[PDB]
Amino acid sequence: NQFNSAIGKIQDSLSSTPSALGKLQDVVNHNAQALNTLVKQLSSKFGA
Amino acid sequence: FNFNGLKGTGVLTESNKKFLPFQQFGRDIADTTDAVRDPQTLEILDIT
Ligand SMILES: *[C@@H]1O[C@H](CO)[C@@H](O)[C@H](O)[C@H]1NC(C)=O
């Protein structure tokens, strides 16, 4: 019974809105931001 | 193509954007032309 209750309660804590999976969100965030900087910087005169 | 002074290659298609009367060629994030009002027939095209 204790095992079943704990397995049940895992899902609620995961579903709580705090950043439980921030460690996996940061990967997509870093990638998207790096590519976006690369494209946005293609519009600079650099002294031209 | 060479619209009015631009140059380069692309595929000119129909568009759905709406340009104000003063509002002649659109632009994108990296600051490159990607729309244009064709001079004679005042259509709006998309350059890709
Ligand atoms: C000439 O230009 C006018 C407006 O500038 C346009 O209405 C007309 O269709 C043009 N004639 C052509 C492209 O033969």
Residues of A in contact with B29 (CB under 8 A): 39-40, 43
Radius of gyration of chain B (CA): 10
The resolution in Å comes to 3.2
Sheet bearing B35-37, strands edge to edge = B12-14, B44-47, B35-37
User: By what technique were these coordinates determined?
Assistant: cryo-EM
Chain A residues 25-44 with CB within 8 Å of chain B: 39-40, 42-43
Give the position of tokens 């969100």.
A25
